[PDB]
Amino acid sequence: VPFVEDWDLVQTLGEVQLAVNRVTEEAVAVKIVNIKKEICINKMLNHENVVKFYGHRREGNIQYLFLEYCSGGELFDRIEPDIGMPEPDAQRFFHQLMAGVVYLHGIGITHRDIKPENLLLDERDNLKISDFGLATVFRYNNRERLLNKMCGTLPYVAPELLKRREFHAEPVDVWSCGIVLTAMLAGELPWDQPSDSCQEYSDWKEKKTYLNPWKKIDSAPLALLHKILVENPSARITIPDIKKDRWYNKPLKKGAKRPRVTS
Numbered sequence: 001v002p003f004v005e006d007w008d009l010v011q012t013l014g015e016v017q018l019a020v021n022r023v024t025e026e027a028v029a030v031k032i033v034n035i036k037k038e039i040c041i042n043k044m045l046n047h048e049n050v051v052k053f054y055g056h057r058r059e060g061n062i063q064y065l066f067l068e069y070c071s072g073g074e075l076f077d078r079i080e081p082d083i084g085m086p087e088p089d090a091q092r093f094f095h096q097l098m099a100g101v102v103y104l105h106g107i108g109i110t111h112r113d114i115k116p117e118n119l120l121l122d123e124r125d126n127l128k129i130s131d132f133g134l135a136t137v138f139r140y141n142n143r144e145r146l147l148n149k150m151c152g153t154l155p156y157v158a159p160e161l162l163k164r165r166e167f168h169a170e171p172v173d174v175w176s177c178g179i180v181l182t183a184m185l186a187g188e189l190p191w192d193q194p195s196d197s198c199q200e201y202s203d204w205k206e207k208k209t210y211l212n213p214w215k216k217i218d219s220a221p222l223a224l225l226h227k228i229l230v231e232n233p234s235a236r237i238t239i240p241d242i243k244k245d246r247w248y249n250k251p252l253k254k255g256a257k258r259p260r261v262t263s
Protein backbone atom coordinates (compact mmCIF):
# COMPACT_ATOMS: atom_id res chain seq x y z
CA VAL A 1 0.00 0.00 0.00
CA PRO A 2 1.78 3.24 -1.14
CA PHE A 3 2.12 6.43 1.05
CA VAL A 4 0.72 4.59 4.19
CA GLU A 5 3.92 5.65 6.13
CA ASP A 6 3.53 9.40 5.23
CA TRP A 7 2.26 11.72 8.04
CA ASP A 8 1.36 15.45 7.68
CA LEU A 9 2.18 17.76 10.64
CA VAL A 10 -0.94 19.97 10.88
CA GLN A 11 -0.64 21.85 14.29
CA THR A 12 1.37 22.23 17.57
CA LEU A 13 0.01 20.61 20.79
CA GLY A 14 2.84 21.39 23.27
CA GLU A 15 7.79 20.17 20.63
CA VAL A 16 4.60 18.04 20.31
CA GLN A 17 2.82 18.20 16.93
CA LEU A 18 -0.44 16.65 15.67
CA ALA A 19 0.35 14.27 12.75
CA VAL A 20 -2.32 13.06 10.27
CA ASN A 21 -1.76 9.98 8.05
CA ARG A 22 -1.82 10.80 4.30
CA VAL A 23 -3.82 7.62 3.41
CA THR A 24 -5.77 6.54 6.56
CA GLU A 25 -6.21 10.07 8.17
CA GLU A 26 -5.28 8.62 11.63
CA ALA A 27 -4.33 11.40 14.09
CA VAL A 28 -1.20 10.84 16.30
CA ALA A 29 1.06 13.09 18.48
CA VAL A 30 4.74 13.43 17.41
CA LYS A 31 7.29 14.56 20.03
CA ILE A 32 10.41 16.12 18.38
CA VAL A 33 13.51 15.93 20.66
CA ASN A 34 17.45 11.01 29.11
CA ILE A 35 15.82 10.36 25.67
CA LYS A 36 17.18 6.74 25.68
CA LYS A 37 15.41 6.09 29.07
CA GLU A 38 12.18 7.87 27.92
CA ILE A 39 11.93 5.59 24.80
CA CYS A 40 12.84 2.40 26.81
CA ILE A 41 10.22 3.13 29.55
CA ASN A 42 7.58 4.00 26.84
CA LYS A 43 8.33 0.61 25.11
CA MET A 44 7.32 -1.17 28.41
CA LEU A 45 3.90 0.62 28.70
CA ASN A 46 0.48 -0.77 27.61
CA HIS A 47 -2.58 0.39 29.62
CA GLU A 48 -5.95 2.10 28.83
CA ASN A 49 -5.01 4.97 31.28
CA VAL A 50 -1.42 5.48 29.91
CA VAL A 51 -0.68 7.36 26.61
CA LYS A 52 0.10 4.72 23.89
CA PHE A 53 3.56 4.54 22.28
CA TYR A 54 3.51 3.48 18.60
CA GLY A 55 7.28 3.72 17.94
CA HIS A 56 10.28 6.00 17.27
CA ARG A 57 12.59 7.15 14.43
CA ARG A 58 16.01 8.86 14.67
CA GLU A 59 16.76 11.30 11.80
CA GLY A 60 20.41 12.19 12.51
CA ASN A 61 20.31 14.42 15.62
CA ILE A 62 16.46 14.78 15.89
CA GLN A 63 14.35 12.05 17.60
CA TYR A 64 10.65 11.52 16.66
CA LEU A 65 8.36 9.89 19.25
CA PHE A 66 5.05 8.58 17.80
CA LEU A 67 2.50 8.80 20.64
CA GLU A 68 -1.31 8.64 21.16
CA TYR A 69 -3.35 11.73 20.19
CA CYS A 70 -5.77 12.74 22.96
CA SER A 71 -8.35 15.15 21.39
CA GLY A 72 -9.82 16.13 24.82
CA GLY A 73 -6.55 17.88 25.70
CA GLU A 74 -5.21 18.45 29.23
CA LEU A 75 -7.11 17.88 32.53
CA PHE A 76 -5.68 21.33 33.49
CA ASP A 77 -8.18 22.98 31.06
CA ARG A 78 -11.16 21.17 32.76
CA ILE A 79 -10.40 22.88 36.11
CA GLU A 80 -12.16 26.28 36.52
CA PRO A 81 -9.81 28.66 38.48
CA ASP A 82 -10.98 29.02 42.16
CA ILE A 83 -13.96 26.64 41.50
CA GLY A 84 -12.61 23.32 40.18
CA MET A 85 -15.16 20.97 38.54
CA PRO A 86 -18.32 18.97 39.59
CA GLU A 87 -17.42 16.38 42.30
CA PRO A 88 -18.71 13.34 40.18
CA ASP A 89 -16.31 14.33 37.30
CA ALA A 90 -13.34 14.65 39.72
CA GLN A 91 -14.16 11.21 41.22
CA ARG A 92 -14.23 9.54 37.74
CA PHE A 93 -10.89 11.25 36.78
CA PHE A 94 -9.29 10.24 40.14
CA HIS A 95 -10.54 6.59 39.60
CA GLN A 96 -8.81 6.46 36.15
CA LEU A 97 -5.68 8.18 37.57
CA MET A 98 -5.45 5.44 40.30
CA ALA A 99 -5.81 2.67 37.61
CA GLY A 100 -2.86 4.15 35.63
CA VAL A 101 -0.65 4.68 38.74
CA VAL A 102 -1.49 1.08 40.00
CA TYR A 103 -0.38 -0.23 36.54
CA LEU A 104 2.88 1.84 36.44
CA HIS A 105 3.83 0.92 40.06
CA GLY A 106 2.99 -2.74 39.26
CA ILE A 107 5.63 -2.92 36.47
CA GLY A 108 8.08 -0.97 38.72
CA ILE A 109 7.77 2.49 37.12
CA THR A 110 7.32 5.85 38.95
CA HIS A 111 6.11 8.86 36.84
CA ARG A 112 7.62 11.50 39.28
CA ASP A 113 5.78 14.47 37.62
CA ILE A 114 2.01 13.84 38.11
CA LYS A 115 0.08 17.13 37.53
CA PRO A 116 -3.05 18.13 35.45
CA GLU A 117 -0.79 19.34 32.54
CA ASN A 118 0.45 15.69 32.16
CA LEU A 119 -3.01 14.09 32.45
CA LEU A 120 -4.61 13.99 28.97
CA LEU A 121 -8.18 13.13 27.90
CA ASP A 122 -9.26 11.16 24.79
CA GLU A 123 -12.50 11.73 22.70
CA ARG A 124 -14.61 9.80 25.32
CA ASP A 125 -12.94 11.89 28.18
CA ASN A 126 -10.79 8.94 29.40
CA LEU A 127 -7.74 10.05 31.42
CA LYS A 128 -4.26 9.05 30.13
CA ILE A 129 -0.95 9.59 31.98
CA SER A 130 1.62 11.30 29.69
CA ASP A 131 5.31 12.51 29.66
CA PHE A 132 7.67 9.75 30.84
CA GLY A 133 10.69 12.06 30.52
CA LEU A 134 11.16 12.21 34.34
CA ALA A 135 10.02 8.56 34.87
CA THR A 136 12.36 5.86 36.24
CA VAL A 137 12.46 2.18 37.30
CA PHE A 138 12.25 1.89 41.14
CA ARG A 139 11.81 -1.94 41.20
CA TYR A 140 14.02 -4.39 39.24
CA ASN A 141 14.26 -8.21 39.82
CA ASN A 142 11.67 -7.68 42.67
CA ARG A 143 14.28 -5.47 44.49
CA GLU A 144 13.23 -1.91 45.35
CA ARG A 145 15.70 0.95 44.95
CA LEU A 146 15.21 4.07 47.11
CA LEU A 147 15.25 7.40 45.26
CA ASN A 148 17.44 10.47 45.97
CA LYS A 149 16.99 12.63 42.82
CA MET A 150 15.03 15.93 42.91
CA CYS A 151 12.30 15.50 40.24
CA GLY A 152 8.88 17.05 39.70
CA THR A 153 7.02 20.38 40.05
CA LEU A 154 7.27 22.07 43.52
CA PRO A 155 3.44 22.50 44.30
CA TYR A 156 2.96 18.72 43.55
CA VAL A 157 6.16 17.26 45.18
CA ALA A 158 5.92 15.27 48.45
CA PRO A 159 7.63 16.84 51.59
CA GLU A 160 10.15 13.91 51.99
CA LEU A 161 11.69 14.82 48.58
CA LEU A 162 12.67 18.21 50.18
CA LYS A 163 13.57 16.95 53.73
CA ARG A 164 15.23 13.53 53.18
CA ARG A 165 18.29 12.28 51.25
CA GLU A 166 16.49 8.98 50.37
CA PHE A 167 12.75 8.17 50.02
CA HIS A 168 10.43 5.45 48.59
CA ALA A 169 9.05 6.12 45.04
CA GLU A 170 5.35 5.08 45.42
CA PRO A 171 4.29 7.57 48.27
CA VAL A 172 5.69 10.45 46.13
CA ASP A 173 3.21 9.62 43.25
CA VAL A 174 0.35 9.13 45.79
CA TRP A 175 1.03 12.70 47.20
CA SER A 176 1.00 14.33 43.67
CA CYS A 177 -2.35 12.51 42.94
CA GLY A 178 -3.71 14.11 46.19
CA ILE A 179 -2.69 17.65 45.07
CA VAL A 180 -4.34 16.84 41.63
CA LEU A 181 -7.55 15.83 43.53
CA THR A 182 -7.34 19.18 45.51
CA ALA A 183 -6.97 21.17 42.22
CA MET A 184 -10.01 19.35 40.67
CA LEU A 185 -12.30 20.11 43.70
CA ALA A 186 -11.12 23.63 44.68
CA GLY A 187 -9.55 24.96 41.44
CA GLU A 188 -6.48 26.15 43.37
CA LEU A 189 -3.15 24.74 44.66
CA PRO A 190 -2.87 24.58 48.48
CA TRP A 191 0.82 25.68 48.77
CA ASP A 192 3.89 26.70 46.68
CA GLN A 193 5.85 23.76 48.27
CA PRO A 194 5.25 21.34 51.25
CA SER A 195 7.72 23.02 53.67
CA ASP A 196 7.43 24.37 57.29
CA SER A 197 8.48 27.84 55.94
CA CYS A 198 5.25 27.79 53.80
CA GLN A 199 2.39 29.19 55.98
CA GLU A 200 -0.36 27.45 53.88
CA TYR A 201 1.34 24.06 54.48
CA SER A 202 1.75 24.84 58.21
CA ASP A 203 -2.02 25.65 58.51
CA TRP A 204 -2.94 22.27 56.89
CA LYS A 205 -0.74 20.41 59.45
CA GLU A 206 -2.52 22.57 62.12
CA LYS A 207 -5.86 21.22 60.65
CA LYS A 208 -7.17 24.76 59.77
CA THR A 209 -9.65 23.34 57.17
CA TYR A 210 -11.91 26.46 57.64
CA LEU A 211 -9.42 28.22 55.27
CA ASN A 212 -9.12 27.93 51.44
CA PRO A 213 -8.83 25.61 49.47
CA TRP A 214 -10.21 23.07 52.07
CA LYS A 215 -13.37 25.17 52.85
CA LYS A 216 -14.58 24.46 49.22
CA ILE A 217 -14.15 20.65 49.50
CA ASP A 218 -16.92 18.42 50.99
CA SER A 219 -16.11 16.44 54.19
CA ALA A 220 -16.10 13.02 52.36
CA PRO A 221 -13.34 13.84 49.71
CA LEU A 222 -11.60 16.07 52.38
CA ALA A 223 -11.34 12.98 54.74
CA LEU A 224 -9.46 11.18 51.87
CA LEU A 225 -7.18 14.26 51.37
CA HIS A 226 -6.50 14.13 55.15
CA LYS A 227 -5.14 10.55 54.56
CA ILE A 228 -3.08 11.32 51.36
CA LEU A 229 -1.48 14.66 52.34
CA VAL A 230 0.28 13.13 55.42
CA GLU A 231 3.88 14.45 55.94
CA ASN A 232 5.29 11.05 57.08
CA PRO A 233 5.54 8.92 53.85
CA SER A 234 5.43 5.69 55.96
CA ALA A 235 2.12 6.78 57.61
CA ARG A 236 0.62 8.07 54.29
CA ILE A 237 -2.25 6.04 52.75
CA THR A 238 -1.28 3.46 50.07
CA ILE A 239 -3.30 3.00 46.84
CA PRO A 240 -4.81 -0.41 48.00
CA ASP A 241 -6.35 1.54 50.95
CA ILE A 242 -7.39 4.59 48.77
CA LYS A 243 -9.59 2.01 46.91
CA LYS A 244 -11.31 1.29 50.34
CA ASP A 245 -12.00 5.03 51.14
CA ARG A 246 -15.71 5.96 51.67
CA TRP A 247 -15.71 8.86 49.12
CA TYR A 248 -13.69 6.83 46.50
CA ASN A 249 -16.55 4.21 46.60
CA LYS A 250 -19.38 6.83 46.99
CA PRO A 251 -21.94 6.64 44.10
CA LEU A 252 -21.99 10.14 42.53
CA LYS A 253 -21.75 9.92 38.71
CA LYS A 254 -24.08 8.51 36.05
CA GLY A 255 -22.75 6.75 32.91
CA ALA A 256 -22.06 8.35 29.57
CA LYS A 257 -25.08 9.92 28.01
CA ARG A 258 -26.64 7.26 25.80
CA PRO A 259 -29.13 7.97 22.99
CA ARG A 260 -32.77 7.20 24.00
CA VAL A 261 -36.38 7.77 22.72
CA THR A 262 -39.81 7.61 24.49
CA SER A 263 -43.33 6.11 23.74
Ligand SMILES: OCc1ccc2c(c1)-c1n[nH]c(-c3ccc(-c4ccc(O)cc4)cc3)c1C2
Pocket (backbone or CB within 6 Å): 013, 014, 016, 029, 031, 038, 042, 051, 067, 068, 069, 070, 071, 072, 073, 074, 120, 130, 131, 132, 133
Ligand atom coordinates in the same frame (compact mmCIF):
# COMPACT_ATOMS: atom_id res chain seq x y z
O1 LIG B 1 -5.99 21.03 22.04
C1 LIG B 1 -6.07 19.66 22.38
C2 LIG B 1 -4.76 19.12 22.91
C3 LIG B 1 -3.94 19.90 23.73
C4 LIG B 1 -2.72 19.42 24.17
C5 LIG B 1 -2.29 18.15 23.81
C6 LIG B 1 -3.12 17.35 23.02
C7 LIG B 1 -4.34 17.84 22.57
C8 LIG B 1 -2.48 16.06 22.82
N1 LIG B 1 -2.70 14.86 22.28
N2 LIG B 1 -1.58 14.14 22.59
C9 LIG B 1 -0.68 14.84 23.31
C10 LIG B 1 0.59 14.23 23.77
C11 LIG B 1 1.58 15.01 24.37
C12 LIG B 1 2.66 14.41 25.01
C13 LIG B 1 2.79 13.02 25.07
C14 LIG B 1 3.98 12.36 25.70
C15 LIG B 1 5.17 13.04 25.94
C16 LIG B 1 6.29 12.39 26.42
C17 LIG B 1 6.24 11.03 26.70
O2 LIG B 1 7.32 10.34 27.16
C18 LIG B 1 5.05 10.35 26.54
C19 LIG B 1 3.93 11.01 26.07
C20 LIG B 1 1.82 12.26 24.42
C21 LIG B 1 0.74 12.85 23.79
C22 LIG B 1 -1.20 16.10 23.49
C23 LIG B 1 -1.00 17.44 24.10
